[PDB]
Coordinates of C-alpha atoms (C1' of nucleotides) in Angstrom, one line a residue:
Chain A
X1 CA -18.5 -16.2 -26.4
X2 CA -18.9 -13.3 -28.9
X3 CA -21.5 -13.9 -31.5
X4 CA -23.1 -11.8 -34.3
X5 CA -26.4 -13.1 -35.7
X6 CA -27.8 -11.3 -38.8
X7 CA -31.5 -11.6 -39.8
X8 CA -34.0 -9.9 -42.0
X9 CA -32.7 -10.9 -45.4
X10 CA -35.0 -12.0 -48.1
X11 CA -36.4 -11.3 -51.6
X12 CA -37.8 -7.9 -52.6
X13 CA -38.6 -6.0 -55.7
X14 CA -36.4 -3.1 -56.9
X15 CA -37.4 0.0 -55.0
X16 CA -38.5 -2.1 -52.0
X17 CA -37.5 -1.8 -48.4
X18 CA -35.8 -4.2 -45.9
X19 CA -34.7 -3.9 -42.3
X20 CA -31.8 -6.1 -41.2
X21 CA -30.9 -6.9 -37.6
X22 CA -27.7 -7.9 -35.9
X23 CA -28.1 -9.5 -32.5
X24 CA -24.9 -9.5 -30.4
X25 CA -24.0 -11.9 -27.6
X26 CA -21.0 -12.1 -25.3
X27 CA -20.4 -8.3 -25.4
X28 CA -22.3 -5.0 -25.3
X29 CA -22.4 -3.0 -28.5
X30 CA -22.4 0.3 -26.5
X31 CA -18.6 0.1 -26.1
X32 CA -17.7 -0.9 -29.7
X33 CA -18.2 0.2 -33.3
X34 CA -20.6 -1.9 -35.4
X35 CA -20.0 -2.2 -39.2
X36 CA -22.1 -3.6 -42.0
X37 CA -20.2 -5.2 -44.9
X38 CA -21.9 -6.9 -47.9
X39 CA -20.6 -9.4 -50.5
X40 CA -22.3 -10.1 -53.8
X41 CA -22.2 -13.8 -54.9
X42 CA -18.7 -14.6 -56.2
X43 CA -17.3 -11.1 -55.6
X44 CA -15.4 -9.3 -52.8
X45 CA -16.2 -7.6 -49.5
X46 CA -17.8 -4.1 -49.8
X47 CA -18.1 -1.8 -46.7
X48 CA -21.6 -0.5 -46.3
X49 CA -22.1 1.5 -43.1
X50 CA -20.9 1.9 -39.5
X51 CA -22.0 3.4 -36.2
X52 CA -19.7 4.7 -33.5
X53 CA -20.0 4.3 -29.7
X54 CA -21.0 7.0 -27.2
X55 CA -21.7 9.5 -30.0
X56 CA -23.9 7.3 -32.2
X57 CA -22.3 9.0 -35.3
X58 CA -23.0 7.1 -38.6
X59 CA -21.0 6.7 -41.8
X60 CA -22.0 5.3 -45.2
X61 CA -20.5 4.2 -48.5
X62 CA -21.2 6.4 -51.6
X63 CA -23.3 3.6 -53.2
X64 CA -25.7 3.5 -50.2
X65 CA -25.7 7.1 -48.9
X66 CA -29.2 8.5 -48.6
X67 CA -30.8 5.1 -49.1
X68 CA -29.6 3.3 -46.0
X69 CA -29.8 4.0 -42.3
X70 CA -27.6 2.4 -39.6
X71 CA -28.6 2.6 -36.0
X72 CA -28.3 0.8 -32.7
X73 CA -30.4 0.0 -29.6
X74 CA -28.1 -0.6 -26.6
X75 CA -31.0 -1.8 -24.4
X76 CA -31.5 -4.6 -27.0
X77 CA -27.8 -5.0 -27.8
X78 CA -28.8 -5.0 -31.4
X79 CA -27.7 -3.0 -34.4
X80 CA -29.9 -2.3 -37.5
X81 CA -29.6 -1.5 -41.1
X82 CA -32.7 0.0 -42.7
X83 CA -32.6 -0.5 -46.5
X84 CA -34.7 1.6 -48.9
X85 CA -34.8 2.3 -52.6
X86 CA -33.2 -1.1 -53.2
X87 CA -31.6 -1.9 -56.6
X88 CA -30.3 -5.2 -58.0
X89 CA -26.9 -3.8 -57.1
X90 CA -27.7 -4.4 -53.4
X91 CA -28.1 -8.2 -54.0
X92 CA -25.5 -9.6 -51.6
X93 CA -24.9 -11.4 -48.3
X94 CA -24.8 -8.8 -45.6
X95 CA -22.4 -9.3 -42.8
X96 CA -22.3 -7.7 -39.3
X97 CA -18.9 -7.0 -37.8
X98 CA -17.6 -5.7 -34.5
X99 CA -14.6 -3.3 -34.6
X100 CA -12.3 -4.7 -31.9
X101 CA -11.0 -2.8 -28.9
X102 CA -8.3 -0.2 -29.8
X103 CA -5.7 -1.5 -27.4
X104 CA -5.8 -5.2 -28.5
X105 CA -6.7 -5.1 -32.2
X106 CA -6.7 -1.4 -33.3
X107 CA -9.4 -0.6 -35.8
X108 CA -9.6 -4.1 -37.3
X109 CA -12.9 -6.1 -37.5
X110 CA -12.1 -8.9 -35.2
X111 CA -15.6 -10.6 -35.2
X112 CA -18.0 -11.3 -38.0
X113 CA -21.4 -12.9 -38.3
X114 CA -22.7 -15.7 -40.7
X115 CA -24.4 -13.1 -42.9
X116 CA -27.9 -12.8 -44.3
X117 CA -28.9 -13.1 -48.0
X118 CA -30.7 -10.1 -49.6
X119 CA -32.0 -10.6 -53.1
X120 CA -33.4 -7.6 -55.0
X121 CA -35.2 -8.7 -58.1
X122 CA -38.5 -8.4 -59.9
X123 CA -38.6 -12.2 -60.5
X124 CA -41.2 -14.2 -58.6
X125 CA -40.4 -17.0 -56.3
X126 CA -40.5 -20.4 -58.0
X127 CA -39.7 -24.0 -57.0
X128 CA -37.3 -26.3 -58.9
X129 CA -38.1 -29.3 -61.0
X130 CA -35.9 -32.3 -60.1
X131 CA -34.6 -34.9 -62.6
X132 CA -32.1 -37.8 -62.1
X133 CA -28.7 -38.2 -63.6
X134 CA -28.8 -42.0 -64.2
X135 CA -25.5 -43.8 -63.4
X136 CA -23.3 -44.8 -66.3
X137 CA -21.2 -47.7 -65.0
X138 CA -23.4 -50.8 -64.3
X139 CA -23.5 -52.8 -61.1
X140 CA -20.7 -55.3 -61.9
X141 CA -18.1 -53.3 -63.9
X142 CA -15.5 -53.3 -61.2
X143 CA -14.8 -49.6 -61.3
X144 CA -16.5 -46.3 -60.5
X145 CA -19.9 -44.9 -61.5
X146 CA -21.2 -41.4 -61.6
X147 CA -24.8 -40.5 -60.7
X148 CA -26.6 -37.4 -59.7
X149 CA -29.6 -35.1 -59.8
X150 CA -30.6 -32.1 -62.0
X151 CA -32.8 -29.5 -60.2
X152 CA -33.8 -26.8 -62.7
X153 CA -35.6 -23.5 -63.0
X154 CA -35.8 -22.1 -59.5
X155 CA -35.6 -18.6 -58.0
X156 CA -34.3 -17.2 -55.8
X157 CA -31.1 -18.7 -54.2
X158 CA -30.4 -20.9 -52.3
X159 CA -31.1 -24.6 -52.5
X160 CA -29.4 -27.4 -50.5
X161 CA -28.8 -30.8 -52.0
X162 CA -27.8 -33.8 -49.8
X163 CA -27.3 -37.5 -50.6
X164 CA -28.6 -40.3 -48.4
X165 CA -29.7 -37.7 -45.9
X166 CA -26.1 -36.5 -45.3
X167 CA -24.8 -40.0 -44.9
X168 CA -23.0 -39.9 -48.3
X169 CA -20.4 -37.0 -48.5
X170 CA -17.3 -38.7 -50.0
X171 CA -17.1 -37.8 -53.7
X172 CA -20.2 -35.6 -53.9
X173 CA -20.1 -32.5 -56.1
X174 CA -23.0 -30.0 -56.0
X175 CA -22.1 -27.5 -58.7
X176 CA -22.7 -23.7 -58.2
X177 CA -26.0 -22.5 -59.7
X178 CA -25.9 -20.9 -63.2
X179 CA -28.4 -18.3 -64.4
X180 CA -30.3 -19.5 -67.5
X181 CA -31.6 -17.1 -70.1
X182 CA -35.0 -17.6 -68.7
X183 CA -34.0 -15.8 -65.5
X184 CA -34.2 -18.9 -63.2
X185 CA -31.3 -20.7 -61.6
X186 CA -30.3 -24.3 -62.2
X187 CA -27.5 -26.5 -60.8
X188 CA -26.5 -30.2 -60.7
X189 CA -25.2 -32.4 -57.9
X190 CA -23.2 -35.6 -58.7
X191 CA -21.2 -38.2 -56.8
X192 CA -18.8 -41.0 -57.8
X193 CA -19.5 -44.4 -56.2
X194 CA -17.9 -47.8 -56.5
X195 CA -19.7 -50.1 -59.0
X196 CA -19.9 -52.8 -56.4
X197 CA -22.4 -50.8 -54.4
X198 CA -25.0 -50.4 -57.2
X199 CA -28.1 -52.5 -56.4
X200 CA -27.2 -52.9 -52.7
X201 CA -26.7 -49.3 -51.7
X202 CA -29.7 -46.8 -51.9
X203 CA -29.0 -43.4 -53.4
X204 CA -31.4 -40.5 -52.8
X205 CA -30.9 -36.8 -53.5
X206 CA -32.6 -34.5 -51.1
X207 CA -33.1 -31.0 -52.5
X208 CA -34.4 -28.2 -50.2
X209 CA -35.6 -24.8 -51.5
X210 CA -36.8 -22.9 -48.5
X211 CA -37.7 -19.6 -50.3
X212 CA -40.6 -21.4 -52.0
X213 CA -41.3 -24.1 -49.3
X214 CA -40.5 -26.8 -51.8
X215 CA -39.2 -30.2 -50.6
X216 CA -38.3 -33.0 -53.0
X217 CA -36.4 -36.3 -52.7
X218 CA -35.6 -38.1 -56.0
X219 CA -34.3 -41.7 -56.2
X220 CA -31.2 -42.6 -58.3
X221 CA -30.7 -46.2 -59.2
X222 CA -29.4 -47.9 -62.4
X223 CA -31.8 -47.0 -65.2
Chain B
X1 CA -12.8 8.1 -51.1
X2 CA -9.6 6.2 -50.7
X3 CA -9.2 3.4 -53.3
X4 CA -7.5 0.2 -52.4
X5 CA -5.8 -1.4 -55.4
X6 CA -4.8 -5.0 -54.5
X7 CA -2.4 -7.2 -56.6
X8 CA -2.4 -9.9 -57.8
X9 CA -6.1 -10.7 -58.1
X10 CA -5.4 -14.5 -57.9
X11 CA -2.4 -16.9 -57.7
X12 CA -1.6 -20.6 -57.7
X13 CA 1.2 -21.6 -55.3
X14 CA 2.5 -24.7 -53.7
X15 CA 2.9 -25.5 -50.0
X16 CA 6.2 -24.0 -48.9
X17 CA 6.2 -21.0 -51.3
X18 CA 6.8 -17.5 -50.0
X19 CA 4.1 -15.2 -51.3
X20 CA 3.6 -11.4 -50.8
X21 CA 0.3 -9.8 -51.6
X22 CA 0.4 -6.1 -52.4
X23 CA -2.3 -3.6 -51.6
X24 CA -1.6 0.1 -52.5
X25 CA -3.7 3.0 -51.4
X26 CA -4.6 5.9 -53.6
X27 CA -3.7 8.3 -50.9
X28 CA -2.1 8.4 -47.4
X29 CA -3.9 6.1 -45.0
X30 CA -1.1 6.2 -42.3
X31 CA -0.9 2.5 -41.1
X32 CA -4.6 1.9 -40.5
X33 CA -4.7 -1.2 -42.8
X34 CA -5.9 -4.6 -41.8
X35 CA -5.9 -8.0 -43.6
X36 CA -8.7 -10.6 -43.7
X37 CA -8.8 -14.3 -44.7
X38 CA -12.0 -15.6 -46.3
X39 CA -12.5 -19.3 -47.2
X40 CA -15.4 -20.2 -49.6
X41 CA -18.8 -20.2 -47.8
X42 CA -17.4 -18.8 -44.5
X43 CA -17.2 -15.5 -42.7
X44 CA -14.0 -13.5 -42.9
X45 CA -11.4 -13.7 -40.1
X46 CA -9.0 -11.0 -38.9
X47 CA -5.4 -11.8 -39.5
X48 CA -3.3 -8.7 -38.7
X49 CA -4.1 -5.1 -37.9
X50 CA -2.4 -1.7 -37.9
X51 CA -0.5 -2.7 -41.1
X52 CA 1.9 -5.0 -39.2
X53 CA 0.5 -6.2 -35.9
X54 CA -0.6 -9.8 -35.7
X55 CA -4.0 -10.7 -34.2
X56 CA -4.4 -13.2 -31.3
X57 CA -4.5 -16.8 -32.3
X58 CA -3.0 -16.3 -35.8
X59 CA 0.2 -18.2 -36.6
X60 CA 3.6 -16.5 -37.1
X61 CA 3.6 -17.3 -40.8
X62 CA 1.6 -14.1 -41.4
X63 CA 3.3 -10.7 -41.5
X64 CA 2.6 -7.3 -42.9
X65 CA 4.7 -4.3 -43.9
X66 CA 4.2 -0.6 -44.9
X67 CA 6.2 1.4 -47.4
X68 CA 4.5 4.8 -47.5
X69 CA 1.1 4.1 -49.2
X70 CA 2.2 0.6 -50.0
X71 CA 1.1 -2.4 -47.9
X72 CA 2.2 -6.0 -48.3
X73 CA 0.9 -9.1 -46.6
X74 CA 3.4 -11.9 -46.5
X75 CA 3.0 -15.5 -45.6
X76 CA 6.5 -16.9 -45.0
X77 CA 5.7 -20.3 -46.5
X78 CA 2.4 -21.7 -47.7
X79 CA 0.8 -24.4 -45.6
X80 CA -2.1 -26.8 -46.1
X81 CA -4.6 -24.6 -44.2
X82 CA -4.2 -21.2 -46.1
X83 CA -6.3 -21.7 -49.2
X84 CA -8.6 -18.7 -49.2
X85 CA -9.2 -15.2 -50.5
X86 CA -7.3 -12.3 -48.8
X87 CA -8.5 -8.7 -48.5
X88 CA -6.9 -5.4 -47.5
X89 CA -9.0 -2.8 -45.7
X90 CA -8.2 0.8 -44.7
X91 CA -9.7 2.4 -41.5
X92 CA -8.0 5.8 -41.8
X93 CA -11.1 7.7 -43.1
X94 CA -14.7 6.9 -43.8
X95 CA -16.0 5.4 -46.0
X96 CA -13.8 2.4 -45.1
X97 CA -12.7 0.6 -48.3
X98 CA -11.7 -3.0 -49.0
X99 CA -9.3 -4.2 -51.7
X100 CA -10.7 -6.2 -54.6
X101 CA -9.3 -9.4 -52.9
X102 CA -6.7 -12.0 -53.8
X103 CA -7.7 -15.6 -54.4
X104 CA -5.0 -18.0 -53.2
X105 CA -5.2 -21.5 -54.7
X106 CA -2.9 -24.5 -54.3
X107 CA -0.5 -25.7 -57.0
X108 CA -0.4 -29.5 -57.7
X109 CA 0.4 -31.9 -60.5
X110 CA -1.7 -32.3 -63.6
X111 CA -4.8 -34.5 -63.1
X112 CA -6.8 -35.8 -66.1
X113 CA -10.6 -35.5 -66.0
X114 CA -13.0 -38.4 -65.8
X115 CA -15.8 -37.7 -68.2
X116 CA -19.5 -38.9 -67.9
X117 CA -22.4 -38.1 -70.2
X118 CA -26.0 -38.1 -68.8
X119 CA -29.0 -38.4 -71.2
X120 CA -32.1 -36.3 -70.5
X121 CA -34.4 -37.8 -67.9
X122 CA -37.5 -39.7 -68.8
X123 CA -39.3 -37.6 -66.1
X124 CA -37.9 -34.5 -67.8
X125 CA -38.9 -35.3 -71.4
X126 CA -42.5 -35.3 -70.1
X127 CA -42.1 -31.6 -69.5
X128 CA -41.2 -30.8 -73.1
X129 CA -37.7 -29.6 -72.5
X130 CA -34.4 -31.5 -72.9
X131 CA -31.1 -31.2 -71.0
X132 CA -28.0 -33.2 -71.7
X133 CA -25.3 -33.0 -68.9
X134 CA -21.6 -33.6 -69.4
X135 CA -19.5 -34.1 -66.3
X136 CA -15.8 -33.6 -65.9
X137 CA -14.9 -35.2 -62.6
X138 CA -11.8 -34.3 -60.6
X139 CA -9.1 -32.6 -62.6
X140 CA -6.3 -30.1 -62.6
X141 CA -6.3 -27.4 -63.9
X142 CA -9.6 -25.5 -64.2
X143 CA -8.8 -24.9 -67.8
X144 CA -11.0 -27.2 -69.9
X145 CA -12.8 -26.9 -73.2
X146 CA -16.3 -28.6 -73.5
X147 CA -17.9 -28.6 -76.9
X148 CA -21.3 -30.0 -77.7
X149 CA -21.7 -32.9 -80.2
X150 CA -23.5 -33.2 -85.7
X151 CA -23.1 -29.4 -86.2
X152 CA -21.3 -28.0 -83.2
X153 CA -23.6 -26.0 -81.1
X154 CA -23.1 -22.5 -80.0
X155 CA -24.8 -20.1 -77.6
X156 CA -27.0 -22.8 -76.0
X157 CA -24.7 -24.2 -73.3
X158 CA -23.8 -23.2 -69.7
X159 CA -20.8 -24.2 -67.6
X160 CA -20.3 -24.4 -63.8
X161 CA -17.1 -25.2 -61.9
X162 CA -16.7 -26.2 -58.3
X163 CA -14.1 -24.8 -55.9
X164 CA -10.8 -26.4 -55.2
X165 CA -11.3 -29.6 -53.1
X166 CA -9.6 -29.2 -49.8
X167 CA -8.2 -32.8 -50.1
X168 CA -7.0 -33.6 -53.6
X169 CA -7.0 -30.0 -54.9
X170 CA -9.1 -31.0 -57.9
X171 CA -11.8 -29.3 -59.9
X172 CA -15.1 -30.5 -61.4
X173 CA -17.2 -29.1 -64.3
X174 CA -20.7 -29.4 -65.7
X175 CA -22.1 -28.4 -69.0
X176 CA -25.8 -28.4 -69.9
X177 CA -27.3 -28.4 -73.5
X178 CA -30.9 -27.5 -73.7
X179 CA -32.8 -27.0 -77.1
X180 CA -36.2 -28.8 -76.9
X181 CA -37.4 -32.4 -76.7
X182 CA -38.8 -32.1 -80.2
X183 CA -35.3 -31.2 -81.4
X184 CA -33.9 -33.9 -79.1
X185 CA -35.8 -36.7 -81.0
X186 CA -34.7 -35.5 -84.5
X187 CA -31.0 -36.3 -83.9
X188 CA -29.5 -39.6 -82.9
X189 CA -26.0 -39.9 -81.3
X190 CA -25.2 -37.2 -78.6
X191 CA -21.7 -36.6 -77.4
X192 CA -19.7 -34.0 -75.4
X193 CA -16.1 -33.4 -76.4
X194 CA -13.6 -32.3 -73.8
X195 CA -10.0 -31.1 -74.1
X196 CA -7.6 -31.0 -71.2
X197 CA -3.9 -30.8 -70.6
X198 CA -3.8 -34.2 -68.9
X199 CA -5.3 -35.7 -72.0
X200 CA -3.2 -36.8 -75.0
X201 CA -6.2 -36.4 -77.3
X202 CA -9.7 -35.0 -77.0
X203 CA -12.0 -37.5 -75.3
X204 CA -15.6 -37.9 -76.4
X205 CA -18.3 -39.7 -74.4
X206 CA -21.5 -40.5 -76.2
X207 CA -24.7 -42.5 -75.9
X208 CA -27.3 -44.0 -78.2
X209 CA -30.9 -42.9 -77.8
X210 CA -32.4 -46.3 -77.0
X211 CA -29.9 -47.7 -74.5
Chain C
rG1 C1' 16.9 25.7 -15.0
rG2 C1' 12.4 28.5 -11.7
rC3 C1' 6.5 30.0 -11.7
rG4 C1' 1.5 29.9 -14.7
rA5 C1' -1.4 29.0 -18.8
rU6 C1' -2.2 27.0 -23.9
rA7 C1' -4.5 20.1 -25.9
rC8 C1' -1.9 21.0 -32.6
rC9 C1' -0.6 16.0 -34.0
rA10 C1' 0.0 11.3 -31.4
rG11 C1' -1.2 8.3 -27.1
rC12 C1' -5.1 7.1 -23.5
rG13 C1' -10.5 6.6 -21.1
rA14 C1' -14.3 -0.3 -23.6
rA15 C1' -13.9 5.8 -27.4
rA16 C1' -11.5 7.2 -35.8
rC17 C1' -16.3 11.9 -34.9
rA18 C1' -18.4 14.1 -30.4
rC19 C1' -17.2 13.9 -24.9
rG20 C1' -13.1 13.3 -21.2
rC21 C1' -8.0 12.8 -19.7
rC22 C1' -2.6 13.6 -20.2
rC23 C1' 1.2 20.2 -20.5
rU24 C1' 6.6 20.6 -22.3
rU25 C1' 6.0 17.3 -23.6
rG26 C1' 4.5 11.5 -26.1
rG27 C1' 7.0 15.7 -30.8
rC28 C1' 14.8 17.5 -29.7
rA29 C1' 6.2 23.2 -30.8
rG30 C1' 5.4 28.2 -29.6
rC31 C1' 3.4 32.6 -26.5
rG32 C1' 3.6 35.0 -20.8
rU33 C1' 6.6 35.6 -16.2
rC34 C1' 11.6 35.5 -12.9

RNA sequence: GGCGAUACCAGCGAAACACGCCCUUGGCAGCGUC
C-alpha cells in the first residue's frame, strides 16, 4: 500500500551538508503535500519543511529557514530535503510524512515513514569495546540469575544488541545509551534467566555497530 | 509563529481512567488541529483531524473538542493498547507547529527492585579502566536512588532507565562507576546502595575482590 | 419577486499558496437594471 522510505541520513561535521530522500510507493506525490518532521533523541516532534502540490510552493521552520531546501521530483515520485550549514541542533531522526486528502482526513498527516538518523558532530566514528556482565546466581541455586554485556565507548548511535541470535527475548533489557564525559556512548544489555539453565544453555550477546563496521559476539557463562 | 502549549507533559493513569489532554494555541488556528500517537521506537500515527473528526481505523475511545483557541483530546477510558506519547499539531498557518507532547504511562501497584552487582570484567581490566555496574531489575516506580559504595562517590556515575515494559509495566535501571583500575585495586569491598518505595530498608549488594 | 455582473470568507477540483470551479448565495454581503 502506501509507504514512505527515508534515506540519506548519516554522520557529518558541523557546517556540513546532507541530502535526504523520501521514496513514495502506493501513491503519487504530485497530488499531495509532503512534509518533513524531525525528532531529536528523547524529545518531541518538530516540523521542518513542506512542499505543496501543483504549485510547488515551499515552507520552512524558523530554525531551518535559509539553510534547508525542500523539493520534489514527480517523475521519480520522490521528495528531497537538502540540508546545509548543519549544527548539532539538527541531530535528529528525520521523518517523511504525507498530508492526507482534504476530503477524508483534512490537513492531518495520515502516513509517516520509518525515519532516517542524522548526526551532526565533530566526533569521529569509533567502535565499541565489549565486556561481559558475569552472572551472579550459580548453576544450582534454584532461583533467577542476571547476566549481560557492557559495550563501551562508541560513536555515533546506534548499536543493536541481541542474545542467542534473537532466540532469547524474554527478560532481556538493553538500556538506552548514556553519553560519558569522554564524548562517546555506552550502554548495557542484561537478561534474567533461571538458575537451572546455567551450564546447559548457551548465552551469547551479539552487538552490532554499523556506523563503524564493527561486529562482536561475546560469550557469557558462569565466571 | 503559532505556539502550541500542551498540558500535562506526562501522566500516569490506570486502565479505565478518563483522561483529557489539553493543547492551547497562542492565537486563533480555527479548527486545523490534529492529534498523533507515538509509541517508543515507532513512527507517529494519525488519530483525529480537524480538531474533532476521527480518522479511519481508530477506535471510538478517542475524541477531540475545541473551545476557541483551546483543544482537548479525550480518551473515554484507558485501555491496554494506549501507552504512548501524544502530540497536538496546527495546520492553520505555516510554519506548522507541534505541541511539546504528552507521555501517557500506565499506573500499577508498587513492585520492588531485584538488585544485582557486576564486578569489572577481566577483559576490561586489561584496558586500564574499571566499570562496576549495578542493576535494578523490574520495579515500579521509576523513582529510585542509587548511591555508590567507603567514601560515597559523587560526580563519577551515570544512570540509564528503560521504558515501561508492555507486559508487567515495570522499569529497569543501570548505574556505572568508572574511576581507573589502579584506583580499583586500592579498595576492597564494592557495593551499590539502592532505595525504593517497595523496599522497607535500603538494600546493598556487594562483592569481594577475589570471588 | 424579475434581468445581468461582482468570487470576500467558507466549500469544492487528488489542491492551506498559486491555478480552476461554484453567484445570492454555502454567509439571514453589497453595487447596477425593471
